[PDB]
């Protein structure tokens, strides 16, 4: 069951995808609001996948070994330049994480997008499934696709001051490495900003 997504001009097709899961909404809330008085301009040159490497799923890591990436992460792309030059911007997180395994090793990995992420207590990790999430396991799907609408207390919040969504990868089941299976499984994320707006053009150096 292949799924061939697209964002801007880059595409990421996974022939093992199990399904896109929308978080908390399907389409982002209204964009022109009481603030910005209509000074927002939707940028589309920034909807682009940008890879990031994460923790190398290794069997040593036990249940509860959460790996957290804060979005938006440092970006050398057009979006990274846009956040530096624009005081306020809002974009859908659309996180995609793919862990490639031989499928002869059974490991259950839970990838979720949690708003206002906080150090989660060991007991909180058991109840971590409440947030939008998908399970990445070599037995069935090596790729998890999650689309989350941007949600913040303010309509637009400076990304440098605060980041609303942090991708969290948790090893629900320790990878069961086998001779046939891959010794270790890496975890890469194809994150892409979606519905990215900006406001308040900011003076450059």
């Amino acid at each position: 069951r292949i799924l061939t997504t697209r964002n801007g001009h880059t595409t990421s097709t996974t022939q093992s995808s199990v399904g896109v899961t929308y978080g908390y909404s399907t389409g982002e809330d209204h964009v022109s609001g009481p603030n910005t008085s209509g000074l927002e301009t939707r940028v589309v040159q920034a909807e682009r996948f940008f890879k990031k490497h994460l923790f190398d799923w290794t069997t040593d890591k036990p249940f509860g070994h959460i790996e957290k990436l804060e979005l938006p992460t440092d970006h050398k792309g057009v979006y990274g330049q846009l956040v530096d030059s624009f005081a306020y911007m809002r974009n859908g997180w659309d996180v995609e994480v793919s862990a490639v395994g031989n499928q002869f090793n059974g490991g259950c990995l839970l990838v979720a997008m949690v708003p206002e992420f906080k150090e989660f207590t060991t007991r909180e990790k058991y109840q971590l499934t409440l947030f939008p999430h998908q399970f990445i396991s070599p037995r069935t799907n090596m790729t998890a696709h999650i689309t989350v609408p941007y949600l913040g207390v303010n309509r637009y919040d400076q990304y440098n001051k605060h980041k609303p969504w942090t991708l969290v990868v948790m090893v629900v089941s320790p990878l069961t490495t086998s001779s046939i299976g891959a010794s270790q499984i890496k975890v890469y994320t194809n994150i892409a900003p979606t519905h990215v707006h900006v406001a308040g053009e900011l003076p450059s150096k």
Partner: antibody
Amino acid sequence: VQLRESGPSLVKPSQTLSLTCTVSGFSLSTYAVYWVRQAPGKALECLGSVSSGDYLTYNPALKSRLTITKDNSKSEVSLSVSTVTPEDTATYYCAKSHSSGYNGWIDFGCYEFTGYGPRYVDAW
Amino acid sequence: VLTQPSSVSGSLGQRVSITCSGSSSNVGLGNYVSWFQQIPGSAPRTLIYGATNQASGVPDRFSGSRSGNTATLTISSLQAEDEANYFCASPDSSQTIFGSGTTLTVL
């Protein structure tokens, strides 16, 4: 880079004890210190680990009988085993990591003692 | 719990191998075994970290390899001065387990 621990004398059964492991030429802000003891005639036993970002992991059995506090500026790690019993007589070691160790509340024994490539162990 | 031979004796100038026996849950789970050599009355030294790489500041004679559920530490041209107790530190499920330890005697 040497580790020095200060331990009390005979502690009466059913009391607590505070051991302080004093690091030297050491970050304690980018490294992690573990607490391992060896009951005589037994194998070593992970007591608990304090990561770089002051996140703690404790031996599941000796958990609730044990606390670990770290102060990076004073550069000393502390261990407080409550409810001491005659079984807890042992020599108590403190170790170094080669990396920060997990900054999570993972709940494992040490969690990093022999993890992966980056973090293994350092001069006790 | 990473059981090891209580006493291992190797003639000086002859390669000696120490075997740490572990279950699938700990030693067998992954190639992440740490070997520590402790001299009596002194803090132990991590001779091998990760079970395939010698730690920095350690002699190259020590060789570390792990096969199946058993991790074996091999010392080549063992010297009387270097003789000390050996511990096969490994990671168990929900805790870290250390080998009982092996006494090394040079004839």
